């Protein structure tokens with residue numbers, strides 16, 4: 001997260017870190033057994049880390065649970081990043097509490113201008129690199145589809161939205177991938193892609209979760 005703020009420990013209780021020896025992606029807890037992340041975060045050997053603030057220090061509220069199964073969206077295209085969504089099932093149920101909690105799925109799509117919370121352990125610099133240990137946060141609005149399409153000609157599908165600031169300075173970045181965009185208590189986006197980070201006229205692009213709720217529910221119901 002570039003241009004954000006320190007969230008505060010366990011203030012984003014649905015935020016997960018995906019670990020394969022190291023943090024490599026975020027995700028969102030949507031019930032005691034399932035995480036939603038980006039398909040471009042797929043790999044084998046995932047351990048889900050819940051209850052994290054400092055990802056390099058055991059602070060007392062963590063739950064580390066290995067993934068049993070990952071399900072990349074049937075129609076994910078890694079070239080275009082269309083349908084950039086994946087579900088991860090935990091080998092055992094998390095113990096839900098005030099610091100480890102699910103986030104609700106949307107019941108309808110969000111509109112341009114809606115204020116959302118974007119979070120993660122990604123790079124905090126727009127030029128150069130610095131990786132935080134504690135969770136970072138950014139409040140950002142959803143941008144109109146027309147401004148999104150204008151920013152990225154030929155690249156924005158009906159399964160994507162832009163959020164952030166066209167002036168630049170404030171954005172998600174490498175290592176935030178797969179993490180949440182939450183708006184009024186609903187998971188509306190997943191950190192997906194962009195051109196660099198926090199660049200003028202290049203806002204972050206996010207998977208449009210509301211299009212996937214039926215797939216998520218039916219996948220959970222049979223897995």
Ligand SMILES: [Ca+2]
Pocket residue numbers: 052053054055056057058059062
């Ligand atoms: Ca920790």
